[PDB]
């Protein structure tokens, strides 16, 4: 084991907007004068260093600004040790809006919008159009359109995105499915978050 240990130890640690996370950095040192510093965003925020054997970095009610690279540096008898960890702050969408809200066999397209989300990148954020618990074959994804939340309103701060996937639909076939589903999935280190929303298929029009 190394003399400097951080818990949790993963190189990237995700925390939801509004949640909390604690990172504890421990330095084992037989000598006096051992110091532990948390920084990584200095300068911008500032670094904090004390002579001690344990320093705890605590994010409470996280904002998007809490995001970035953190470095714990421990100094023991002329030697320095380090641990670098990315704090990733995400907001999983709190609402999905489908358009049209219900489908009719013959509708050529359906859009699914995730509200107040970040990150928006496709390596993390994914949209699926499902019939049953399977992807609807023949559904052509037009590609996510990203807009900022859009003229934000009162409350707090932090800018989030609105992301819309759209699919050109294949014929639903027959027997006609009772429903399709849009699922937005966010995959981050150690996490998979999902929101599946029913899309009624009105066989008789409407």
Curated annotation (Swiss-Prot):
Q: In its UniProt record, which GO terms are filed under biological process?
A: cell adhesion; cell-matrix adhesion; heterotypic cell-cell adhesion; immune response; integrin-mediated signaling pathway; leukocyte tethering or rolling; positive regulation of leukocyte migration; positive regulation of lymphocyte migration
Q: How is it modified after translation?
A: The Ser/Thr-rich mucin-like domain may provide possible sites for O-glycosylation.
Q: Where in the cell is it found?
A: Membrane
In this protein, the residues bearing a glycan are 61
Which pairs of positions does the record mark as disulfide bonds? 25-72, 29-76, 112-182
Q: Name one GO cellular component term.
A: membrane
Expressed in which tissues = Highly expressed on high endothelial venules (HEV) and lamina propia venules found in the small intestine, and to a lesser extent in the colon and spleen. Very low levels of expression found in pancreas and brain. Not expressed in the thymus, prostate, ovaries, testis, heart, placenta, lung, liver, skeletal muscle, kidney or peripheral blood leukocytes.
Q: Which key words tag this protein in UniProt?
A: Cell adhesion, Disulfide bond, Glycoprotein, Immunoglobulin domain, Membrane, Repeat, Signal, Transmembrane, Transmembrane helix
List residues in topological domain: Extracellular: 1-202
**What membrane topology term does the record carry?**
Single-pass type I membrane protein
Extract one GO molecular function annotation from the record.
Answer: integrin binding involved in cell-matrix adhesion
Residues of the Ig-like domain: 1-90, 91-202
Transcription regulation among keywords = no
Q: How does it assemble?
A: Homodimer.
The UniProt function text for this chain reads: Cell adhesion leukocyte receptor expressed by mucosal venules, helps to direct lymphocyte traffic into mucosal tissues including the Peyer patches and the intestinal lamina propria. It can bind both integrin alpha-4/beta-7 and L-selectin, regulating both the passage and retention of leukocytes. Isoform 2, lacking the mucin-like domain, may be specialized in supporting integrin alpha-4/beta-7-dependent adhesion strengthening, independent of L-selectin binding.
Q: What is this protein called?
A: Mucosal addressin cell adhesion molecule 1
Classification lineage: Eukaryota, Metazoa, Chordata, Craniata, Vertebrata
